[PDB]
Short mmCIF file of C-alpha atoms in Angstrom, two decimals:
data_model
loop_
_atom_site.label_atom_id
_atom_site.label_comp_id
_atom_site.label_asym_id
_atom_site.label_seq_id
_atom_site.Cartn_x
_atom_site.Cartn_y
_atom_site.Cartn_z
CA UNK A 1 -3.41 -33.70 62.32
CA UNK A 2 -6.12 -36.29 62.71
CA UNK A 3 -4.25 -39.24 61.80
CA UNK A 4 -1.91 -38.24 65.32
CA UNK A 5 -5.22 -38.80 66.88
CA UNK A 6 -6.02 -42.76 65.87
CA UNK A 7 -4.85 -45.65 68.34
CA UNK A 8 -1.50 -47.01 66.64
CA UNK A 9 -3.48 -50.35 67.37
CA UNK A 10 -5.30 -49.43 64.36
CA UNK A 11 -2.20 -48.94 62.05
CA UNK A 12 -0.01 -51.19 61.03
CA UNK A 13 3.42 -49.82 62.40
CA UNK A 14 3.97 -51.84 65.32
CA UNK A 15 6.11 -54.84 64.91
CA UNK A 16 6.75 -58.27 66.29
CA UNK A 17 10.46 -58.66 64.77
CA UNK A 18 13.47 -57.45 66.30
CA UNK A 19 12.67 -56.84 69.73
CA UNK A 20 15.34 -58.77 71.01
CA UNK A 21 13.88 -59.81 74.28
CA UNK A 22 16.31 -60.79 77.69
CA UNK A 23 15.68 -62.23 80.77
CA UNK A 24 17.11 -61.04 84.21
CA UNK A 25 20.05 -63.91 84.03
CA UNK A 26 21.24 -63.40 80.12
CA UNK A 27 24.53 -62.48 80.49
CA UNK A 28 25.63 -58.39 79.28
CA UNK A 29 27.99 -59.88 77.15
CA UNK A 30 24.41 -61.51 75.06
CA UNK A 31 22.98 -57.96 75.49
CA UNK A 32 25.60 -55.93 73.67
CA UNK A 33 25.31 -58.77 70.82
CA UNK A 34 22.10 -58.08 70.18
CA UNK A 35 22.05 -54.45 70.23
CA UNK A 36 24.98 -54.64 67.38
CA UNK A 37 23.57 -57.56 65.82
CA UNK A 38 19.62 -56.29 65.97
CA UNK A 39 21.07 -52.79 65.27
CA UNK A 40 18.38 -51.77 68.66
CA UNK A 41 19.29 -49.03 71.11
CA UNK A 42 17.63 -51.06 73.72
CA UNK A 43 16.72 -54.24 74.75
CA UNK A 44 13.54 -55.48 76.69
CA UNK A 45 13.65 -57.88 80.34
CA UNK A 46 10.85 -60.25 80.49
CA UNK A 47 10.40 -62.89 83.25
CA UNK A 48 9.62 -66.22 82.25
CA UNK A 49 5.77 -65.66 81.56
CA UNK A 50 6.76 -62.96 79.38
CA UNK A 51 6.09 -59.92 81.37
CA UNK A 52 7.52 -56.60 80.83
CA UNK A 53 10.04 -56.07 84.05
CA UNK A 54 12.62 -53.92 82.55
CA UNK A 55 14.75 -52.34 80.00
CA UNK A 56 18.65 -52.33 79.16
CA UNK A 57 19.56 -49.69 76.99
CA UNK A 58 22.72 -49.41 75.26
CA UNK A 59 23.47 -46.17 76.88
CA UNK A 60 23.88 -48.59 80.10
CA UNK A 61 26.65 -50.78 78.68
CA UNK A 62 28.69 -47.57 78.38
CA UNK A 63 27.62 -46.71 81.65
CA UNK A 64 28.45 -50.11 83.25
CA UNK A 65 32.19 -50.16 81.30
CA UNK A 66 32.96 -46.52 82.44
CA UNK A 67 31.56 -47.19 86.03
CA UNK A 68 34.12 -50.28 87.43
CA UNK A 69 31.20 -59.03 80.84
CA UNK A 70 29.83 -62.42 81.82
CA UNK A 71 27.73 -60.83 84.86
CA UNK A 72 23.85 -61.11 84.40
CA UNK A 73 21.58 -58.18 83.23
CA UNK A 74 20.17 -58.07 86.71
CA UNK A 75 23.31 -58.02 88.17
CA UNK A 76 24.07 -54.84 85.66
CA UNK A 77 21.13 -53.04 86.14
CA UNK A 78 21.48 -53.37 90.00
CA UNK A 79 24.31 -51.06 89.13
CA UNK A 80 22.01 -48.46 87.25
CA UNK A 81 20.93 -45.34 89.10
CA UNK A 82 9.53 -47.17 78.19
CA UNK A 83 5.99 -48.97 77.60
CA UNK A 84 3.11 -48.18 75.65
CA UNK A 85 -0.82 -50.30 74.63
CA UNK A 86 -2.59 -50.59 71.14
CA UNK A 87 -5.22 -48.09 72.49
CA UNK A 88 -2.53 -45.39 72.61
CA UNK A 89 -2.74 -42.81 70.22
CA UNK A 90 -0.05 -41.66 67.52
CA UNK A 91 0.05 -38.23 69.21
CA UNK A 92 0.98 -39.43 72.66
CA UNK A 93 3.53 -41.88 71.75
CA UNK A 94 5.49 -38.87 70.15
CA UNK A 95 5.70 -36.40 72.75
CA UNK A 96 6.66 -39.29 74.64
CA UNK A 97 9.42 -40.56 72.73
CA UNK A 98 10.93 -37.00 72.71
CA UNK A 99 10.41 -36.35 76.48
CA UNK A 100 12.46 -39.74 76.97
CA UNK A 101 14.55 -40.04 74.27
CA UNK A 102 14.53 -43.13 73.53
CA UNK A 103 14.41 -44.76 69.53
CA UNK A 104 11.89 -47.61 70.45
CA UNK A 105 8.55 -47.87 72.68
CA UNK A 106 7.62 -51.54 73.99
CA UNK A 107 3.75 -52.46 73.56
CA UNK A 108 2.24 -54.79 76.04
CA UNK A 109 -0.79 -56.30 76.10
CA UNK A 110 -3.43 -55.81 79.03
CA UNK A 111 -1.67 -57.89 81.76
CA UNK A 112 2.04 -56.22 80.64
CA UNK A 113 3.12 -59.08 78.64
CA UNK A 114 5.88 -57.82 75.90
CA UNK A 115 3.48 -58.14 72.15
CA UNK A 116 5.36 -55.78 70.17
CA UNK A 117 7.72 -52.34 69.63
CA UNK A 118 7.08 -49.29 68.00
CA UNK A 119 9.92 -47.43 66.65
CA UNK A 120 10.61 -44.11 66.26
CA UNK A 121 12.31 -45.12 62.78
CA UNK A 122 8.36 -46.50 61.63
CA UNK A 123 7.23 -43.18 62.79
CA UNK A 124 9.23 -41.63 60.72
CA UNK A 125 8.29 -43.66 57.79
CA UNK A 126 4.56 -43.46 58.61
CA UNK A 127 4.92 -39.70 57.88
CA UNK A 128 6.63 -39.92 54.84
CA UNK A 129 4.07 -42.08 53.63
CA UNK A 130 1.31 -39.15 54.01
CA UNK B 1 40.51 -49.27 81.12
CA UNK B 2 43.46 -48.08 78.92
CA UNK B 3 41.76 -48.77 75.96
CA UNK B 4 38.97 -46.03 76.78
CA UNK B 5 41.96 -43.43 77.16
CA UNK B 6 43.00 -43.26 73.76
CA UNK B 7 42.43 -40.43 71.40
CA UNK B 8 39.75 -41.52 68.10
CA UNK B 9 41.83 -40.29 65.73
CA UNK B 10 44.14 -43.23 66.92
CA UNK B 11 41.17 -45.92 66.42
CA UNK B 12 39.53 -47.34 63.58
CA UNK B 13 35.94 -45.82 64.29
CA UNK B 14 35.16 -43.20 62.88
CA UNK B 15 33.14 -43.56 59.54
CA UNK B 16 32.78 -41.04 56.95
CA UNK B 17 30.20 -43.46 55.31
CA UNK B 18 26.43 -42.27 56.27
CA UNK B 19 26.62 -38.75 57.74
CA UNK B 20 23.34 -37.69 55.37
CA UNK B 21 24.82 -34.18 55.48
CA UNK B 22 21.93 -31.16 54.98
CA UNK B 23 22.59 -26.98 54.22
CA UNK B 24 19.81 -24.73 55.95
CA UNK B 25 18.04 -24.19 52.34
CA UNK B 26 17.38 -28.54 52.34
CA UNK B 27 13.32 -29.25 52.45
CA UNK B 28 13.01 -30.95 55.44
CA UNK B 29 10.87 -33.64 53.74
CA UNK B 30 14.07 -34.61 52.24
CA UNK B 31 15.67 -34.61 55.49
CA UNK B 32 13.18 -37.28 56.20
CA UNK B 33 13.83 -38.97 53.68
CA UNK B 34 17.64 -39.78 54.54
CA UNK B 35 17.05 -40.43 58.30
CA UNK B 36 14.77 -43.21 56.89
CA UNK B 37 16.56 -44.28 54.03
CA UNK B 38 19.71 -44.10 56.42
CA UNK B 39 18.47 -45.10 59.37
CA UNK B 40 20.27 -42.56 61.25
CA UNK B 41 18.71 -40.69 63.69
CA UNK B 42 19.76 -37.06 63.30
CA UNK B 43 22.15 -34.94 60.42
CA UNK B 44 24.23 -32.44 60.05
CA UNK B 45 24.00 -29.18 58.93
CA UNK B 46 26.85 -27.58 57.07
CA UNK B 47 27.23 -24.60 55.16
CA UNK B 48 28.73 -24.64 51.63
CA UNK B 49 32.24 -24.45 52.91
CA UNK B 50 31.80 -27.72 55.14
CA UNK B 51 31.43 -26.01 58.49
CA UNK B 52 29.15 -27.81 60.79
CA UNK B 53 26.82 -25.47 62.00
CA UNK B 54 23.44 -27.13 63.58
CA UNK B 55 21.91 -30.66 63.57
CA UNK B 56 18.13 -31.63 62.97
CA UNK B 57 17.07 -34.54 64.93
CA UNK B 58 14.61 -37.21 63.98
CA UNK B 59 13.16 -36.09 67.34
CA UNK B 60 12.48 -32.48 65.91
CA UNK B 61 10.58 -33.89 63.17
CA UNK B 62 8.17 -35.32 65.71
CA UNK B 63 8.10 -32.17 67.29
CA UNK B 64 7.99 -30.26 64.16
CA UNK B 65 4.28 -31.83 62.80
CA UNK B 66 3.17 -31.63 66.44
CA UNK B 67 4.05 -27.83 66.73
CA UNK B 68 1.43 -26.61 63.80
CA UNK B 69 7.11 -30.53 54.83
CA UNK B 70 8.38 -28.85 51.80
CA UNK B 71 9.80 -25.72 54.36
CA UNK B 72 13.77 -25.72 54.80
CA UNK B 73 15.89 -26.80 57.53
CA UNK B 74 16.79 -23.56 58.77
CA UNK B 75 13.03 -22.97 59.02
CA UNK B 76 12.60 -25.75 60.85
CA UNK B 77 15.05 -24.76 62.87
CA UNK B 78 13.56 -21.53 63.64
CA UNK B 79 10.39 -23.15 65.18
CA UNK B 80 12.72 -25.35 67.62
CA UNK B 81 13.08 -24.19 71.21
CA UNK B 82 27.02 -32.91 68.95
CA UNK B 83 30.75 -32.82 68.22
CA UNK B 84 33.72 -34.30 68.70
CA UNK B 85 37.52 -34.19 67.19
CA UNK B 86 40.24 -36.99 66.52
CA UNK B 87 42.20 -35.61 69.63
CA UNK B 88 39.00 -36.61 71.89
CA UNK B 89 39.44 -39.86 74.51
CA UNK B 90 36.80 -42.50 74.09
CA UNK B 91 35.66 -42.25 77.96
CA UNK B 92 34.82 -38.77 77.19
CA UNK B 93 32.38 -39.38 74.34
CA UNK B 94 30.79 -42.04 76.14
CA UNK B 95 30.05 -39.81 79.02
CA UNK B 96 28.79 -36.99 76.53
CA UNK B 97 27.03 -39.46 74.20
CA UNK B 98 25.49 -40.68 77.67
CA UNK B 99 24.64 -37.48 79.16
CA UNK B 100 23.08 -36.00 75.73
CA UNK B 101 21.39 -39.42 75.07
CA UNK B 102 22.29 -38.98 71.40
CA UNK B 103 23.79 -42.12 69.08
CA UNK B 104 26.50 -40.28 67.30
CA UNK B 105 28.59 -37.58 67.17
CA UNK B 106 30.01 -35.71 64.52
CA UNK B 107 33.51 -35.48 64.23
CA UNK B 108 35.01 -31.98 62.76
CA UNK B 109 38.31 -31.31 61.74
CA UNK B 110 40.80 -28.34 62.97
CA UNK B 111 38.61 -25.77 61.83
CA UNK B 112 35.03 -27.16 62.85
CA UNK B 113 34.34 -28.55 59.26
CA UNK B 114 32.09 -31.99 59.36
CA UNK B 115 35.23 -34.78 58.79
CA UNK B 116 33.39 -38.03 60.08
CA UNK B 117 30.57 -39.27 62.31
CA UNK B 118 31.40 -41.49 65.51
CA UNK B 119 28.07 -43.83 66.13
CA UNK B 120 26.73 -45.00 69.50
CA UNK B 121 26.41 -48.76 67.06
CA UNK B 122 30.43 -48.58 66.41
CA UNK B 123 31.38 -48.31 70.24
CA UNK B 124 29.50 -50.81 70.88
CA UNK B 125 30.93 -52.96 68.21
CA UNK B 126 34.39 -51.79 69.70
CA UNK B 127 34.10 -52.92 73.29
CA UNK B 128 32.31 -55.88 71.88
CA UNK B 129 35.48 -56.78 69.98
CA UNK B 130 37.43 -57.13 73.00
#
């Protein structure tokens, strides 16, 4: 149980590569793409000094399509009715992920700039490797 | 709109390719295993004449080694507090997928035996196409 307890800062699970980051104008249409293409459940919005604003999920395209293209992600998510640090543990992050949900955490640094994601597929693999 | 109206079974999405199918007696360690090496995010459980009966989520893995390995499925199971057919519209599996937050459903045939798997990735894909 300990190794629940350990900051995943001090693993080597989180990841810089496929986070597939958007901005408030990138069109849906550039959204969906990358969810297919990145194979990600969820995209993160940044603003142009690369803060953490927002998320799109893939759950939201079907939402927009069944609820009335080129329009912008802020546009989208206008029509809509998460985050984690380094110094959070293991433990935390996984009662979180199944409370939300969701297949992918964003890290941020101390100011909430996007550094990184943590997916629950690497979780999964860190546990098999044990 | 139209195209969200029309029954599965008359589209070209269903996949019988990765469904990582499991019986109650598999060790869950080697259910692990084929979420990971599938990257899927949950399987189904059959029993030996291909009825589906439960599914074990990547989620109740988590929840599994934060609860208190080599055990079965159907343990697993036991310590823990969907589907679709060909007939089924799109819309309505988009609201369900939506509503469950899942990323696929499995599809059964006439008599509830596992036929297919319908991924949150393929719809996608399919409005994408359009």
């Amino acid at each position: 149980t300990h190794f629940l307890k350990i900051p995943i800062g001090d693993l080597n699970i989180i990841t810089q590569d496929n986070m597939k980051s958007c901005q408030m104008t990138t069109p849906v249409i550039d959204v969906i793409q990358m969810l297919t293409q990145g194979r990600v459940s969820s995209v993160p919005i940044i603003d142009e000094n690369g803060y953490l604003i927002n998320v799109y999920e893939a759950y939201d395209v079907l939402g927009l399509i069944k609820g009335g293209l080129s329009l912008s992600v802020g546009e989208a998510l206008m029509r809509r009715s998460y985050t984690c640090t380094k110094n959070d543990k293991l433990s935390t992050i996984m009662d979180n992920i199944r409370k939300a949900r969701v297949h992918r955490f964003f890290v941020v640094d101390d100011v909430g700039r996007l550094v990184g994601v943590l997916t629950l597929s690497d979780i999964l693999k860190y546990i098999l490797l044990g």
